[PDB]
Motif scaffolding. Structure first.
Motif, PDB file in Angstrom:
ATOM      1  N   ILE H  11       0.852  -1.188   0.000  1.00  0.00           N
ATOM      2  CA  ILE H  11       0.000   0.000   0.000  1.00  0.00           C
ATOM      3  C   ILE H  11       0.886   1.235   0.000  1.00  0.00           C
ATOM      4  O   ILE H  11       1.759   1.377   0.861  1.00  0.00           O
ATOM      5  N   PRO H  24       1.550  10.581  10.411  1.00  0.00           N
ATOM      6  CA  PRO H  24       1.158   9.244   9.949  1.00  0.00           C
ATOM      7  C   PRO H  24       2.157   8.153  10.269  1.00  0.00           C
ATOM      8  O   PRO H  24       1.770   6.979  10.275  1.00  0.00           O
ATOM      9  N   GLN H  31      -5.436   0.259  13.382  1.00  0.00           N
ATOM     10  CA  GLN H  31      -4.987  -0.706  12.393  1.00  0.00           C
ATOM     11  C   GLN H  31      -5.172  -2.142  12.842  1.00  0.00           C
ATOM     12  O   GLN H  31      -4.811  -3.053  12.098  1.00  0.00           O
ATOM     13  N   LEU H  35      -3.751  -4.115   8.959  1.00  0.00           N
ATOM     14  CA  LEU H  35      -2.426  -3.959   8.380  1.00  0.00           C
ATOM     15  C   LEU H  35      -1.374  -4.586   9.285  1.00  0.00           C
ATOM     16  O   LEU H  35      -1.506  -4.592  10.507  1.00  0.00           O
ATOM     17  N   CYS H  36      -0.326  -5.110   8.673  1.00  0.00           N
ATOM     18  CA  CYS H  36       0.668  -5.853   9.426  1.00  0.00           C
ATOM     19  C   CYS H  36       1.326  -4.935  10.451  1.00  0.00           C
ATOM     20  O   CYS H  36       1.561  -3.760  10.161  1.00  0.00           O
ATOM     21  N   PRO H  37       1.608  -5.416  11.667  1.00  0.00           N
ATOM     22  CA  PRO H  37       2.288  -4.535  12.619  1.00  0.00           C
ATOM     23  C   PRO H  37       3.765  -4.374  12.330  1.00  0.00           C
ATOM     24  O   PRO H  37       4.313  -3.291  12.560  1.00  0.00           O
ATOM     25  N   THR H  40       6.994  -2.901   7.761  1.00  0.00           N
ATOM     26  CA  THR H  40       7.084  -1.553   7.209  1.00  0.00           C
ATOM     27  C   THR H  40       8.535  -1.275   6.841  1.00  0.00           C
ATOM     28  O   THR H  40       9.437  -1.556   7.642  1.00  0.00           O
ATOM     29  N   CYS H  46       9.676   4.847   6.440  1.00  0.00           N
ATOM     30  CA  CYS H  46       9.107   4.144   7.578  1.00  0.00           C
ATOM     31  C   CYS H  46       7.742   4.703   7.924  1.00  0.00           C
ATOM     32  O   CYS H  46       7.617   5.868   8.296  1.00  0.00           O
ATOM     33  N   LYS H  50       3.016   0.512   3.507  1.00  0.00           N
ATOM     34  CA  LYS H  50       2.434  -0.473   4.406  1.00  0.00           C
ATOM     35  C   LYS H  50       1.964  -1.691   3.621  1.00  0.00           C
ATOM     36  O   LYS H  50       1.958  -1.697   2.392  1.00  0.00           O
ATOM     37  N   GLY H 146     -14.321   0.877  -0.919  1.00  0.00           N
ATOM     38  CA  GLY H 146     -12.975   1.312  -0.645  1.00  0.00           C
ATOM     39  C   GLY H 146     -12.526   1.167   0.792  1.00  0.00           C
ATOM     40  O   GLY H 146     -11.330   1.311   1.057  1.00  0.00           O
ATOM     41  N   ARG H 147     -13.431   0.891   1.724  1.00  0.00           N
ATOM     42  CA  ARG H 147     -13.078   0.699   3.125  1.00  0.00           C
ATOM     43  C   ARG H 147     -12.829  -0.772   3.437  1.00  0.00           C
ATOM     44  O   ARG H 147     -13.101  -1.656   2.628  1.00  0.00           O
TER      45      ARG H 147
END
Ligand SMILES: [Mg+2]
Ligand SMILES: [Zn+2]
Ligand SMILES: [Zn+2]
Ligand SMILES: [Zn+2]
Lengths: 186, 209, 149, 50, 123, 189, 241, 295, 50, 107, 97, 298
Positions: H11, H24, H31, H35-37, H40, H46, H50, H146-147
């Protein structure tokens, strides 16, 4: 302007302050009720909030359908005007109107008894209508004037208008969806 | 009230007198250690005292080198000093036949007199201090190392030692609070003795521009 | 704030005492202990976290703020304030973290990475300005220091 | 440095004057102490201390 | 002046309470009234008068076009009678529809299993 | 403090703001010359009654206590009718019967566009603006600012949702050229 | 250029000062060890002390403020009306537009916007007459040059060694080629005796290209001829990371 | 192989490193499980690049027809039938659809319950979400795509909806995922709606209130981060670096790797499969195309 | 660095090879060190790897 | 508090043009004379009175009772209190100690 | 040149330039930054103080006041462009005693 | 060390309050020597510390106090003949504050920038209440001007020295002697030592500009050194004092404090090429040629 000032902080007499005030604002001249100076006590200005239109005097409460109707029946027995809203479509079908699935509207039914209203233990209120029942809920409150009227178009040139009364409350109907799913599972 | 103002008057008198002594004019030691109660004894209470006159002082003279050189100290009363008041002061000065004088303002002084305060005469000059500043003598503040003025011969010897031209030294601004305290003019030199972190001392020199 | 001050004080006391206890239990000839004492690699915090307890996670020196409406994650009640919900961690690295502790731990950890990324530019700009301003001076044979002029 | 894959530059001056100058002022043996406060930098590191 | 609120008024109903019985009547319309301010505009107009192959049609979207459309329809004047007038009580009688208290209505035959599919037609 | 909405739909992206620069509320949008006190917009839409405004905003003591100032300046002005307010906004129209209808249409079709209105019955748009004011005034009670990192307010695009636009543009351009050629060739060649 | 034309009397091209003051500054400039920052300070000082004078003491001439009337356009406010008693100079100036008012009706509403405009020919032929003794007061090293060379009429072209055969050719080559092309067309086309308005518009366009030939960062250009891509001026390649 | 697969889920961000805002980059509790923790990229990117978690979905636009029709019956009141004073009471709530105002309701609770019961039954698309907001007295409905979505097991009266019998049936092959959706056993939630729930992380922590239950906690972590064995026994940066270093290992690319002609291609002569493997290693078939040797 | 994740990996791997088993390292799960130790001692290596 | 015309719903202003002041409208001839009194203001606004009596100000506010510190209890920090913001807003009490070379000041 | 596809050679970035100043060395940084990077030689006419060519001042039509001088190429390029903007640096030189 | 900075936590002197700038931003703010800075702090010593004499009240004599609660109620006084504006005083509570304000002091305070309200327009009827009379100004002003006259309780403009605020706890552990101190948040050094009753000679500030303006350059450079050494020590690294001594000596040798900025560097340095080498490289050349300056190479 005075520069040398000796302030004071020893406890003063509160009554002296209240009497100074009294002498300063309580010398009433309200007796000046002359011709140009009358005010009709019904002809005052009004507050921002209707519920408390009482800024100067001469010198809404929570409710539920069952309580209001019980009050209406019990403490008085005259006639009242009620405004209520039904679900978009009624349970019935068009009466030989030759039909698009047009909605069954109150305007498209014959006169006479149409159903019953039932009040159950714990104060729950429902409307019985044919094979089904509709929920009833007290609507949004209202505080400004609403007037019921009948308009008579007696002629293409002119007509007549007569008032019938004011409206005090609103009622809201609803289908009992969970009952429909329980009656007819999916 | 009438006690805080008298305290202010005593304090400003003490500080200004200390400055007179420091500049080397004539002064009597017994007045240096004048007490506030002594000030009350020699001058009445605030309501009975008149600001524009009571404190005016001219006893100091340059006895250090010329006892005949009198100096004058004035204390106006109005929050902002006006042109007419300084005209009265200048005519009184001319009557007294002196060169310079000090003025203490309460809150301010008018812009036209601000302009006049630079061009009265080449032979006459005036120096204005705020009541607020004078309330404390900076010379005693912990963050102000001792400053000393020296004669032309001393600067001659100094510039001879390091083989310098006068315009090479570090500068000090004329408007500097200490420079104003000492009333020194442009082109003089000042010695400083910075208190070391230890018993030692470092000497440095600054020029007034 | 008083409640915060108390809670953080109590949680810090927990971690210190537990870690203390482990070092008493710890045997000589242990490797981490040996590496800690002579200072080659480690510190007594690290041997305490690995063995005894990972401490309160801190974001900007404060407990984890609410992310949703009045809580940190849905897994906790509204306005909850017990230690576990606001980011404390009770399991050691030996015994493994749980999903919620692991998430909070990561939140704290990423701040270090972000800081290191941000540091890059500003410090260089400061140094460049400063050395530029000072570069000229030199110490003369007279023991004075003089600018180019 | 950290020996986890870094890289380092090397330069060779092309004069005898610059050779002498690099050896005297810049040599390692004359730079054991940092000019910030005079402490020693080039000392034993992990796994020699142990 | 009156401003209309909604086009469809079918679903709403006005009911009058009575002891032991309720009578319902559909509304022909609900309207909202406001005090007029056009007299200031009239005063302003009086002051002003005292002082002194076509392109594709787009009139369908112009305010005065609707004003003209409304102007086509003639006015009607109505006689008024207040609530104090017993004429109002005479007209009131029309609310209570006559009939037997207990009547098995011919309509409303649909059972609940149906009712769900009429107010929620297949997508 | 202030509030804004990115009113974007299939036709265009537009954006409106609010200002509390002095304490009185102003409405600000790019195609007008300058920001305008809000009561003027309210009157222009047809809520001229001061009672109607204050009821719309709210009844609680602090909310209308704080809202009070935002109308005095208006009664200093002579804006007592819809026509007067509309004329004023007309004078403040900016460009890259102008005095009257151009402002009416601009309001009806370019301000808070995502709110639909058809017959010039602005009531829906009035309610929305009233909500917008009440939010910002009450937002000062506690500094609960809407953090832009709450992942509820993020949306993700995709390959198809992107390429839709690009083909849209290319097809429009293709048609317009066919149009252009058709005009030029037949009538003269 | 605008600083100096605000420090110059148009009637007689003299510096507006009194002799005592002139001698005073001359003593200031005599002082030894003049420093660059001191040069800046005394530039500000002379600007302030001479702007106060509104008439030329040498010839009594009243001169107005000179102001930039537009982007790369300068005007002299000599013929300005004032809220006070109307000056005789503007009284005589304004009445001279009778023929233009008679011929065209837009002259009369804006007859008061007519001022003394300045252009390279007018300016250059004014400074070519300047007495030499005024030059040092204008912070000009006479050995460094003189005011007439300050307005340009001839341009160098850099040697090939700093421009490669391919930047196809470098922007400078394109810039020079388009400038000369304009020069040829404008000379032969003015020799064709064409209309006024568009001849001067070509002049302005020429000036604009020359400005961009130095500096590519200017952003005041109107929309309808605004550049659509970035190009490297001299400052772009001298400045930046 | 991991490099190509990981990239498909990446992403980007519109912010594109414009400037430092301390915004951000930080990880946010919103999240959780989308999304993966750990995955990144290190460096200046950084927190601006994502990757998605293992189990996730994206929504698309819906009809908006039925939704408003249903709402119109459950007692939503039309705004234009009432004056302005009504917004001020402490008992009405504003109903929003796609940020567009819809009406005024009393007793919101009954509207939400019925709406959720209606969606579970199947009359509203499962990707329509409705959530309540107390502070501003509003209830929101949204249908735009989109969500992001997640499937959670439903919990009622302290017992899970799903029962051992169902798992046996699914194992035997009788049923499939869509069945669980229709039988009102599992349902999709979003960030806006899970704000008004109480997820249960395991069985033992179910209590009086919990409404839902997690399918598998280990599905927080993305594809690239599934390679780590025992990821919860490590300090956090150590997990982050591996994600950005398993993308570079030399392995095998695919069965057609011999026929390909490519700008640069690295192969490993004698690769071997891991001896301590995650479950995600099984799901993405990594052990068919290994990237290392057991030392 | 506190990668106790790696110290467990090595033990689990060692105990897996000695009887043909593949082990698991799932996040928030996986084979517990407790059981693996007993499986090593069945083969005769020291129950903690060293 | 605001006043509005029953006839036109607009805000009312106060003026005098006769023997008695009145509330009146600037759009319709509605007027309401005020023969009596009312007791609610707009809560006006002037800034913080900090140093009007700075330093060693007047000595009339001396007092007898005072608190003491839990650490040293030297003789010089007699009590004071102050207020937060406004008429319906609270008061706050602090304790501050100043000999030298420290920063002590309790709440 | 810069790259690795093309030939390279690394950069003495400005931080190193300060490092070399710091030690107090002087020939080292001269060597690193002028002898072995862009060493170049030019000629100038002392009478007019501007560069020419081949010991012949095209401005002065003479060969007497000319002289040769060593100068980094980038500096020479700087003089050309500045002259190109009519900003003429008329440099002044003398004996190197 | 600025590169070595890690931005460590718990730097709020152990009370998690009094948030002053520290770290690389702090060093930046000293070096730039901006005439305005964030979160200034001034400090003072009175005579003595702890309990019951001559020390405490002075703090309330100089810090933030709104007119505010001194009036327990604020309510209108309309009467058919006319109306006025009145304010009650909470005298008993003022003695609780024990600030020496009173009816006459406030009456003296008003008319300061307050629409030129005359002394006659304000009257005192008792020590507890004061009132002010409206008037028409005719400059967008009428009899109904009352609304704009609402300028008395929290914020328009006030008596006293503004730009002061509140300070908080800072405890000590070294109880061997009794030592306590008063902190002041604000940006008026001159007045705060000008107050009666304070050991002015031992007051200090962290605003480098303020000390310079009020005490002199020697006082300035001593603050620069104090601040750098202080800041550095809190962060835990070490710098020999001679380095900072030279930094401040250079920064303060021309007569005034000069920040190390483009403006400052252009002020001290003179070389055209050097200036063109650092910043604003595209502006100086035309100027330099205009003056026709000749430069050395040193
Ligand atoms: Mg490395
Ligand atoms: Zn002349
Ligand atoms: Zn009105
Ligand atoms: Zn030559």
């Amino acid at each position: 302007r005075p520069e040398v000032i000796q302030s004071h902080s020893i406890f003063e007499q509160g009554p002296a302050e209240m009497m100074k005030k009294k002498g300063n604002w309580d010398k009433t001249v309200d007796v000046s009720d002359m011709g140009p100076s009358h005010i009709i006590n019904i002809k005052k200005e009004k507050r921002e909030t209707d519920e408390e239109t009482k800024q100067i005097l001469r010198m809404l409460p929570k409710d539920v359908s069952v309580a209001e109707l019980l009050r209406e029946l019990s403490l008085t027995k005259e006639e009242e005007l009620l405004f209520l809203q039904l679900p978009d479509t009624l349970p019935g079908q068009p009466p030989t109107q030759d039909i698009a699935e047009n909605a069954c509207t109150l305007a498209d039914l014959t006169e006479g008894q149409v159903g019953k209203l039932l009040i159950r233990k714990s104060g729950r209120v429902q409307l019985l209508l044919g094979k089904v029942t509709l929920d009833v809920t007290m609507g949004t409150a209202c505080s400004f004037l609403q007037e019921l009227v009948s308009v008579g178009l007696g002629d293409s040139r002119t007509g007549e208008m007569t008032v019938l009364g004011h409206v005090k409350h609103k009622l809201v109907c609803s289908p009992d969806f969970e009952s429909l799913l329980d009656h007819k599972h999916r | 009230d009438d006690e805080e103002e008298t305290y202010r008057l005593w304090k400003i008198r003490k500080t200004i007198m200390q400055l007179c002594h420091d500049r080397g004019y004539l002064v009597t030691q017994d007045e240096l250690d004048q007490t506030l109660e002594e000030f009350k004894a020699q001058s009445g209470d605030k309501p009975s005292e008149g600001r524009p006159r009571r404190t005016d002082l001219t006893v100091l003279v340059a006895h250090n080198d010329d006892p005949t050189d009198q100096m004058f100290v004035f204390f106006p009363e109005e929050p902002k000093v006006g042109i007419k008041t300084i005209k009265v002061y200048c005519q009184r000065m001319q009557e007294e036949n002196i060169t310079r004088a000090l003025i203490v303002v309460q809150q301010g002084m008018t812009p036209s007199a601000k302009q006049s305060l630079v061009d009265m005469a080449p032979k006459y000059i005036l120096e204005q201090f705020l009541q607020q500043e004078l309330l404390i003598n900076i010379t005693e503040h912990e963050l102000v190392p001792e400053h000393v003025v020296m004669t032309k011969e001393e600067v001659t010897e100094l510039l001879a030692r390091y083989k310098l031209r006068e315009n090479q030294l570090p500068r000090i601004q004329a408007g500097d609070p200490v420079a104003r305290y000492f009333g020194i003019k442009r082109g003089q030199v000042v010695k400083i003795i910075r208190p070391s972190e230890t018993a030692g001392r470092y000497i440095t020199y600054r020029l007034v521009q | 704030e008083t409640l915060e001050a108390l809670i953080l004080k109590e949680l810090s006391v927990i971690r210190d005492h537990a870690g203390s206890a482990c070092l008493r239990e710890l045997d000589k000839s242990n490797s981490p202990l040996t590496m800690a004492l002579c200072g080659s690699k480690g510190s007594f915090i690290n041997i305490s976290q690995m063995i005894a307890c990972v401490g309160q996670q801190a974001i900007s020196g404060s407990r984890v703020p609410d992310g949703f409406e009045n809580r940190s994650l849905p897994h906790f009640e509204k306005h909850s304030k017990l230690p576990a919900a606001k980011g404390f961690v009770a399991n050691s690295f030996y015994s493994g973290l749980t999903p919620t502790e692991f998430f909070f731990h990561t939140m704290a950890g990423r701040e270090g990475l972000v800081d290191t990324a941000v540091k890059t530019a500003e410090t260089g700009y400061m140094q460049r300005r400063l050395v530029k301003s000072l570069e000229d001076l030199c110490s003369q044979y007279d023991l004075t220091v003089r600018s180019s002029t | 440095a950290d020996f986890d894959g870094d890289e380092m530059n090397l330069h060779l001056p092309q004069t005898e004057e610059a050779k002498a100058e690099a050896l005297v002022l810049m040599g390692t043996k004359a730079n054991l102490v940092t000019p910030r406060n005079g402490e020693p930098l080039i000392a034993a590191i992990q796994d020699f201390l142990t | 002046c009156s401003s209309q609120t909604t086009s469809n008024t079918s679903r709403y109903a006005a009911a009058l309470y009575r002891q032991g019985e309720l009578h319902l009547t559909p509304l022909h319309g609900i309207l909202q009234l406001r005090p007029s301010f056009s007299y200031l505009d009239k005063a302003d107009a009086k002051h002003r008068e005292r002082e002194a192959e076509q392109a594709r049609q787009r009139r369908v979207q112009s305010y005065e076009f609707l004003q003209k459309k409304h102007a086509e329809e003639p006015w009607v004047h109505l006689h008024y009678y207040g609530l104090r007038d017993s004429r109002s009580e005479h007209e009131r009688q029309y609310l209570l529809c006559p009939g037997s208290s207990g009547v098995e209505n011919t309509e409303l035959v649909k059972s609940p299993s149906e009712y769900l599919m009429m107010l929620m037609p297949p997508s | 403090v202030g509030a804004s909405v990115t009113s974007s739909t299939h036709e265009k992206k537009s954006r409106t703001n609010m200002a509390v620069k002095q304490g009185r509320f102003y409405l600000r949008h790019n195609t007008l010359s300058e920001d305008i006190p809000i009561v003027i917009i309210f009157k222009a839409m047809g809520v001229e009654s001061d009672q109607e405004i204050v009821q719309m905003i709210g009844t609680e003591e602090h909310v209308m206590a704080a809202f009070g100032p935002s109308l005095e300046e208006c009664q200093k002005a002579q804006i007592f009718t819809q026509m007067q307010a509309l004329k004023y906004i007309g004078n403040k129209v900016r460009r890259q019967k102008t005095k009257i209808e151009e402002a009416r249409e601009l309001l009806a079709s370019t301000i808070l566009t995502h709110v639909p209105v058809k017959e010039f019955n602005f009531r829906a748009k009035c309610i929305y603006t009233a909500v917008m004011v009440r939010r910002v005034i009450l937002a000062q009670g506690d500094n609960k600012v809407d953090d832009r990192d709450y992942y509820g307010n993020k949306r993700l695009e995709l390959a198809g949702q992107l390429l839709s636009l690009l083909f849209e543009d290319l097809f429009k351009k293709f048609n317009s050229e066919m149009k252009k050629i058709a005009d030029q060739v037949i009538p003269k060649q | 250029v605008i600083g100096i034309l605000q420090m110059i009397c148009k009637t007689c091209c003299h510096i507006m000062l009194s002799q005592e003051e002139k001698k005073q500054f001359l003593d200031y400039l005599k002082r030894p060890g003049l420093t660059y920052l001191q040069k800046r300070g005394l530039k500000k000082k002379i600007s302030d002390k001479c702007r106060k004078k509104n008439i030329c003491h040498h010839c009594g001439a009243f001169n107005g403020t000179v102001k930039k009337c537009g982007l790369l356009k300068i005007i002299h406010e000599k013929y300005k009306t004032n809220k006070k008693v109307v000056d005789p100079i503007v009284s005589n100036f304004l009445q001279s537009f009778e023929t233009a008012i008679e011929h065209n009706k837009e002259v009369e509403p804006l007859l008061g916007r007519a001022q003394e405009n300045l252009n390279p020919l007018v300016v250059l032929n004014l400074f070519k007459r300047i007495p030499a003794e005024d030059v040092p007061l204008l912070l000009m090293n006479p050995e460094a040059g003189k005011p007439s060379d300050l307005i340009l009429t001839r341009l160098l072209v850099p040697p090939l060694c700093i421009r490669p055969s391919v930047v196809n050719e470098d922007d400078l080559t394109m810039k020079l080629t388009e400038i000369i092309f304009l020069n040829d067309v404008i000379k032969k086309h003015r020799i064709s005796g064409a209309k006024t308005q568009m001849i001067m518009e070509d002049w302005d366009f020429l000036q604009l290209q020359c400005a961009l030939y130095i500096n590519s960062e200017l952003s005041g250009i109107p929309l309808n001829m605004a550049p659509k891509k970035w190009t490297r001026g001299f400052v772009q390649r001298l400045k930046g990371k | 192989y991991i490099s190509a697969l990981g990239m498909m889920t990446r992403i980007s961000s519109q912010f594109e490193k414009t400037r430092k805002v301390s915004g951000p980059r930080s990880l946010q509790p919103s999240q959780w499980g989308m999304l993966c923790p750990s995955d990144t990229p290190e460096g200046e990117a950084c927190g601006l690049v994502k990757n998605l978690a293992l189990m996730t979905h994206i929504t698309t636009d819906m009809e908006d027809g039925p939704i408003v029709k249903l709402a119109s019956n459950l007692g939503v009141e039309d705004v234009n039938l009432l004056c302005g004073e009504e917004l001020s009471y402490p008992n009405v709530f504003l109903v929003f659809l796609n940020g567009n105002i819809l009406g005024v309701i009393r007793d919101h609770k009954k509207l939400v319950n019925t709406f959720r019961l209606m969606r579970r039954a199947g009359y509203i698309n499962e990707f329509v979400s409705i959530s309540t907001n107390l502070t501003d007295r509003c209830v929101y409905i949204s249908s735009d795509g989109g969500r992001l979505c997640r499937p959670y097991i439903i919990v009622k009266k302290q017992k899970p909806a799903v029962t051992n019998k169902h798992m046996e049936e699914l194992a035997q092959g009788y049923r499939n995922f869509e069945d669980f959706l229709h039988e009102s056993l599992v349902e999709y939630l979003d960030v806006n709606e899970e704000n008004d729930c109480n997820i249960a992380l395991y069985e033992h922590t179910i209590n009086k209130d919990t409404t839902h239950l997690e399918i598998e906690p280990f599905t927080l972590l993305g594809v690239c981060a599934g390679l780590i064995p025992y990821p919860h026994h490590n300090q956090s940066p150590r997990n982050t670096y591996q994600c950005a270093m398993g993308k570079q290992a030399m392995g095998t690319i695919g069965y057609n790797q011999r026929n390909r002609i490519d700008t640069l291609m690295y192969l490993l002569a004698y690769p071997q499969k891991p001896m301590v493997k995650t479950k995600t290693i099984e799901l993405i078939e990594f052990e068919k195309l290994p990237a290392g040797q057991n030392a | 660095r506190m990668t106790v994740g790696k110290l467990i990996e090595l033990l689990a791997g060692k105990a897996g090879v000695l009887d043909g088993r593949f082990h698991y390292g799932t996040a928030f799960g996986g084979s517990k060190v407790k059981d693996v130790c007993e499986d090593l001692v069945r083969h005769g290596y020291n129950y903690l790897g060293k | 508090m605001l006043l509005f015309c029953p006839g036109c719903g607009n805000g009312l202003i106060v003026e005098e043009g006769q023997r008695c002041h009145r509330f009146s409208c600037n759009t319709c001839p509605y007027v309401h004379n005020i023969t009596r009194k009312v007791t609610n203001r707009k809560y006006p606004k002037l800034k913080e009175v900090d140093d009007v009596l700075g330093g060693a100000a007047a000595w009339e506010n001396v007092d007898s009772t005072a608190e003491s510190c839990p650490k040293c209890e030297h003789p010089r920090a007699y009590f004071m209190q102050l207020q937060t913001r406004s008429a319906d807003e609270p008061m706050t009490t602090f304790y501050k100690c100043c000999n030298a070379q420290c920063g002590h000041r309790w709440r | 040149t810069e790259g690795r596809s093309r030939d390279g050679g690394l950069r003495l970035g400005e931080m190193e330039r300060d490092c070399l100043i710091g030690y107090g060395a002087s020939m080292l940084l001269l060597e690193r930054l002028m002898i072995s990077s862009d060493a170049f030689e030019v000629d100038v006419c002392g009478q007019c103080g501007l560069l020419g060519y081949s010991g012949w001042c095209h401005y002065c039509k003479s060969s007497c006041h000319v002289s040769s001088l060593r100068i980094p190429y980038a500096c020479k390029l700087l003089f050309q462009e500045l002259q190109s903007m009519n900003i003429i640096p008329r440099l002044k030189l003398s004996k190197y005693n | 060390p600025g590169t070595q900075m890690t931005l460590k936590t718990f730097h709020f002197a152990g009370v998690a309050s009094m948030n002053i700038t520290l770290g690389v931003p702090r060093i930046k703010e000293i070096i730039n020597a901006s005439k305005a800075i964030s979160t200034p702090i001034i400090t003072a010593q009175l005579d003595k510390d702890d309990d019951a004499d001559y020390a405490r009240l002075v703090k309330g004599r100089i810090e933030k106090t709104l007119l505010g609660e001194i009036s327990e109620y604020i309510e209108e006084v309309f009467l058919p003949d006319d109306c006025f504006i009145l304010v009650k005083l909470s005298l008993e509570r003022i003695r609780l504050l024990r600030l020496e304000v009173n009816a006459e002091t406030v009456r003296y305070s008003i008319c300061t920038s307050k629409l030129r309200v005359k002394p006659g327009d304000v009257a005192v009827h008792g020590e507890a209440v004061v009132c002010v009379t409206p008037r028409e100004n005719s400059k967008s002003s009428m009899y109904y001007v009352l609304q704009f006259l609402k300028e008395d309780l929290p914020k328009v403009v006030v008596q006293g020295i503004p730009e002061v605020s509140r300070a908080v706890i800072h405890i000590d552990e070294q109880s061997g002697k009794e030592k306590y101190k008063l902190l002041v948040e604000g940006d008026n050094l001159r007045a705060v030592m000008a107050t009666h009753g304070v050991k002015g000679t031992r007051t200090t500030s962290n605003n480098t500009y303020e000390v310079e303006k009020t005490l002199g350059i020697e006082a300035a450079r001593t603050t620069i050194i104090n601040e750098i050494q202080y800041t550095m020590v809190n962060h835990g690294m070490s710098i020999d004092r001679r380095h900072v001594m030279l930094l401040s000596d250079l920064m303060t040798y021309k007569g005034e404090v000069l920040g190390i900025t483009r403006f400052g560097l252009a002020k001290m340095k003179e070389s055209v090429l050097m200036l063109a080498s650092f910043e604003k490289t595209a502006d100086h050349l035309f100027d330099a040629a205009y003056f026709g300056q000749k430069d050395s190479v040193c």
